[model samples]
Target: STGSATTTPIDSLDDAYITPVQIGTPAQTLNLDFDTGSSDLWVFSSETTASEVDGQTIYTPSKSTTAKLLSGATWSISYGDGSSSSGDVYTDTVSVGGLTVTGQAVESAKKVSSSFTEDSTIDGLLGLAFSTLNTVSPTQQKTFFDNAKASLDSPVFTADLGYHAPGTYNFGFIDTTAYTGSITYTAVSTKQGFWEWTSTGYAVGSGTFKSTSIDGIADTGTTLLYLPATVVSAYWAQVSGAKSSSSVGGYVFPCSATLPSFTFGVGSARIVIPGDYIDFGPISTGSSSCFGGIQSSAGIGINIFGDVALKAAFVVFNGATTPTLGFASK
Candidate 1:
């Protein structure tokens, strides 16, 4: 049987979506962020110190008879954003939508960063990246998807992320009715534990398309679009009164500035991001200062096609041979 689940926005503060997952024997449920950028199924748990728990829900292995500790196993991770988590390991029955995977590795958090402790809604992350990226020491763990893929009819999943709305994540089957027109396919390179691909070029508004090859990862966990400094400068230059503020630490513009639409070349397919989407939000201090959604991926080496780009199209995470990406109109 195919598995599917609805993904809801975590909150209005950021563009993150969470899906409910059931774990352990009695089935403790947790709202987990499905991240395509990393590979690990970690959750806030009873092992976490009381001071670090905050308001987030915790998963207790002791409550479930099916849970087993992986002795001498541990995992820790630090994200680019500085958010971090470290934990002990446990193997338990895990369920998402209607699909169940026995002996799924579930990392139980023993510590979390202040950012995670502050946000009560996001309990943990369900990494969808390749199993090779798992962080467990002694014996690296496999993701839930990897464990369940054999039972699935097709080794594929779809991410239908909405703009300030609820979306659906479908596993093993593609629901043609959810998308319009045909899906333009692009081959993916998973060398770096992500769905990495290159765009043929980019264009500003109705301007001529520049054939500058851009290599980036399709990261649902990221909120903004990150490109090379040169690419970011070209797009922001089109907007009047736009400048890279030292205080804001990114490109910012006046609220009244007329922003241009940005288009990315995907083979022959063009994915357009409207002008409105370019204006992320106001820079906290200045009344008229607004942050640009497109920023330089300077320090981070690899560019990121984040939620800002993903929500504009119907995305297919094809895990079959060649590991291609299919895009269609939402």
Candidate 2:
């Protein structure tokens, strides 16, 4: 059987999307971030310190009849943005939409950093990346998708994330109505446990398309699109008064600046991100300065095609042999 769920933006911040997930026998539902960047199913749980729980919902494993400790298994993870959490592991019944996976590893957080504690709304994370990235110790754990794939009619899932709006995540099938135009397919390298691929080139606005290679991952959890320093510079150069701001972090420009669109080549297709989307609103509420959603990935090692870029296209995370990615316009 297939499953599908509606995904909605969290508070218009455009930072992430939230999807409902049911865990345990009686079904303790939690709104989780369906992240493609990492592989670990962790939640604010009974094990989390009271001080760190804040307003977040905790997953009470004791209340679930199917929940069982994995004995010596433990897990810890840190994100690129410095958010972190660590906990013991438990096997529980987990379900997304109507798709259920039994004995799925659920990391029960005992400790969380300020980044997670401060965000009281997001209760947990459901990783959709390659299972090789799972942080569980003693033995690597399979993600929800990994366990469910064999039962699926097709080992494929689609991400239709939107900009400050609702979208859908479809599992075991693809909805033809979700996207327009022919889907362009590209091979993905999962050696790094990511849906990593290479873009043929990029261009600033109506400028000439440069023929260069850009290796990166399509990360749904990341909020901004990060590229090489030179590419960021080329894009911002076309926007008057734009400058790298250490104060606000990344590049900033006047709120009223007329921004230019950015386009990246995916195989033979050119996915264009509208100019307005790049102007990531104001630096702060009522602030006259704005931050560019596209930033430099100088020290990050690999470029990240985050929400800012993903929202501009429909993406398919194909788990078939030689794993591939299919992109099309929404």
Candidate 3:
């Protein structure tokens, strides 16, 4: 069975993406962040702290006749951005696009971080990462992706994240027209519970393509692109007023600065990022300083190819015995 879902940016800034998902018997539709960075299909629900609930939609398990409590099972998860959530578990009928999966673990959030409550865009996160990262205690639960993989025509999923428009997430099939040029396939490591892959190197604008092994994860959940400090510095150097400021956090430059396009290699394929994409937008309302889409991963530990990079190309997460990632220029 193959499935397809449309995902839209949460805001004009393209900070994150949200896709519609159906949970329960009568279909409690909710917009969920299709996060590849984490492995937990958690949601804001009736079980959530009342005050913590904002304007976001809530999934009430009691409303779903198919919902069944997973006795003694609880789950907690914290993101790299510091947002966190914890809750009890339940098995319910969950569907995305047209793909249906019964007995999918639906973590009902009883507690959530301020960041999550503050954002009205997404009600929860539907993890696309490996199930090994699931936070459930005693026994780790399978993600909606994992549970549905078995019946899928192919054990793979593709993310065609857009810049300002709605992109698509396809399960078990690839949308050929979504991309241009041939796709470059590379090996991936799920050992760390991430769709981590390596880029051959990068080039700043029309400059040189350095030969270096740049390892990073394709995370639609994150907002920016993070890489080695040297590479980040090189890219920023091409900008007239760009600087790494601790006061403001990350590289920032004049909004009118001549931004250079960034190009990263996936094996032999070179995917280009438009210069406008590098201008993440002004730091504040009417401010002249703009934050950069590319930043140093020095303190981040692991480099992340977030929405900034992922939106620049079509990415495929192959969930085979030997997982691989495919990149294609649009």
Candidate 4:
């Protein structure tokens, strides 16, 4: 009736999170990037070219009896500027931990970009965004969470990511012990096929709340917290010797700078991101200046509350007919 799995950050900066998944009948386990910004459960497989395999694990459908080709179905996902992948579809038995979903659509990669192939540890990506974002042609397929929703105690999933520590992902039910304060619920609009919501405003360290509304998405795939330039400038200006350099990295400050915590609103509750979390390591090897975890999203066109902010709170993605997002302190 439920599924639970441990998600580990790939690096000290929490660049990405990986979750082990059992795919096919015989249960070949592969460590996958648990991403919420995209929708498509794809993997490196036998169909992938040898040149692209690298050291990543592959999902061999021939080894599993439960694997069935979904005739005429194909998928192509494009991102970046843009490196992409395309593949055929197969339905097979898939499970995260305890929860199992039969005939879950599994995209078998026939081609992948060098960036993806170069990543040795991340075999593939398991997208948790709404199925509306799926790239399957002809017939759209459901996401792992979407298919497992019916069997779950409740049609919801929670993300409890941590800072340089293994976190937990839960489906079907929310673990009460996972959070401290009561969750502040907010309406979510999936029209954009993201966990899109609005933040009341933000505060720099213990500064006053700006009392402005910022629309953004809770993206597990992104590594940094991106906000409007105005909000971003307000925070970085408070830092000594911090500069937003052009033709180079934006927002860099002395490593020893007395940084201030950043806080954002979820209804009435404020989730504060510690200063240490924002001091993204040194800009270069043995460098005195360091990059920031919070950046301006002006170029991105949309605000994004990535892992930098999410790790500071407990987030629930309620996928009922009318979805809603819940945030709580832990």
Candidate 5:
């Protein structure tokens, strides 16, 4: 079960990196999102009676020789998306990419209501995005990273997601290649563990927003980047034939034949999301328009660089040397 699912340390808001703790093992490789905003390592279970668990990766504890669960420690987690689920506390040996840590705690959700369970891609949440977001209590706190900190080569965990939408997710180590000269550091504003930093401003299409400011929250837990409607609209305006075929889906391009490059700005860091990622497929939404690469969250105050964009660059959530942050290019 080594490659089934993987959990690695990603930089936290506290200028530290938190390792992801997943269900079963990485060899069994279930796709998981590290949610910093929420807590608890929840996985769909074969024993779950919930009809919503249809296609989601369900962990079969019977197969894992080291699996263990805490009796009476049941939990439920609710999110801003209005989704919720409940489950019992469980533990097992978790290994990712050949590194094995035993007695890791996991929350086996018997019931999940979010659309997250609709797709079969993801197995569960490897919650290192936030230490407090989990269902674990002081009387019952148990996380693979928490218990196995002493076993790690470093106490810090870092996340390195594939930024270009390659669907590659690597956990535990900072690439260090992303940083060229010096590491930019920001203080923790919230206990939720989101790595929040102020971005200089943004530019979309031909229009340059002078007084604009963007906040960077390195969130591997989020599925997509949540950008402001104005910025999203302007950015899409630059795409050749970019239009909203659907009410609020990813951007729809003119055709699958060709597309213009769309770029994002983080201070001086200019990043682009290629056209292939922009177009989901050749399919159109009711013939109105094709799928769009960038989407609109409208009123969202912060822009989240999701796994889609985070993995492209080497990210270092360096808490290894000290409590301060460090970034390097891999």
Candidate 6:
């Protein structure tokens, strides 16, 4: 689906993390990552080379006596980041929230990297992305959402409070109240299970700021909100202490005074970001300063409404179901 010119493009955000409502009365829960760009569910295993990982969660199937393996299925996946792992498939009943499905396809790898192995918090990833990115080769293949689509409650709605809140995303329904009533929604371009859009410009306070670049789209798979270099640098210039630094790539500033309020272009849809999001993490960096809301990435192919912007709004994608998204106040 990647190279097909006829493939429709959709703006997707990654805030859809669901704690698996495991089948029956299982003790442990599986944390799932939702992405409309790909579809897959992967969990780490206790049999994995435990020493290879850094700080990511690993799964222990033994902990749940209910877990079972597929008779003769073996699978392996390699990502753009050059990470790889392999394991056998297992089909046991699994659940999401209150819904339960029997004979769910689960993968367990014996070898995994530290990025997933070291951390105990997130056991595995539940890819709600897309089916196109899945590795479904005959030699080895398994898809979580690909198998579970038939069992979901409703079209799953997502709210990515970006990593700022524990209660960020919601499935089965999109909360329209999560966003300010004023929204500039773009028309969904014609494509297969894809969403593409364009916006007029952005605004800050009472001022209407025209984009020095083209309108943008949103994606959940990516972590940062990327804008045109012109818009990014210009927004920072308006902030009182907005200044560029060497270490952080873009611009950094102090937050000692009232910061200039800014929002992205959704044609006319204005997503207001609260001030609390502006505070820098390290007190040692300087007065509680904020970074330039926009940063430079000249000639970038696509402008993204990344996590920073996502945190302030409720984002919903109609994956494999329909076109157009539903955004509202959280």
Q: lDDT (CA) for every model shown?
A: 0.88, 0.91, 0.93, 0.91, 0.54, 0.52
- Which 10-residue window of candidate 3 scores lowest in summed lDDT? 275-284
Compared with the true structure, what per-residue lDDT tens digits does model 6 show for residues 30-70?
Answer: 55544443344567656666575455455666666777766
Most lDDT-accurate candidate: 3
- Rate residue 151 of model 5 by lDDT: 56
RMSD to truth, every model:
1.5, 1.0, 0.8, 1.3, 6.3, 7.3
lDDT of 1: 0.88
Off by over 4 Å in 3: none
lDDT of 2 by residue, 1-330 (tens): 788988888876577888999999899998899999999999999999998988888899999999999999999999999899999999999988898889999999999999899987799899999999999998989999999999887999889988778999999998899989989999899999999999999999899999899999999999899999999999999988999999888999997789899999999888989887786778889988888999999999899999989999999999997899988887
Candidate 5 global lDDT: 0.54
**Lowest lDDT 10-residue stretch of candidate 4:** 78-87
Q: Model 4, residue 75: what's the lDDT?
A: 98
Question: Residue-wise lDDT of candidate 1 within 34-105, one digit each (tens)?
Answer: 998999999999999788888888899999999999999999998889999998999999998998999999
The better-scoring model by lDDT among 4 and 6 is 4
Instruction: List the candidate numbers ranked by TM-score, top first.
Output: 3, 2, 4, 1, 5, 6
Off by over 4 Å in 6: 1-27, 32-38, 53-57, 62-91, 101-104, 109-120, 139-146, 160-163, 175-196, 211-217, 278-280, 283-301
**Can you tell me which runs of candidate 2 are displaced by over 4 Å?**
none
Q: What TM-score does candidate 1 get on C-alpha atoms? A: 0.96
The sequence of per-residue lDDT tens digits that candidate 3 reaches over residues 1-330 is 988999999898888899999999999999999999988999999999999999999999999999999999999999998889999999999999999999999999999999999998899999998899999997899988899888999999999988888999999888899899888999999889999999999999999898899999999899899999999999999999889999899999998789889999999889999988877788889999999999999978999999889999999999988999999999
Clashes of each: 0, 0, 0, 0, 46, 49
> For model 3, what is the C-alpha lDDT against the true structure?
0.93
Q: lDDT rank, highest first?
A: 3, 2, 4, 1, 5, 6
TM-score of every candidate: 0.96, 0.98, 0.99, 0.97, 0.72, 0.71
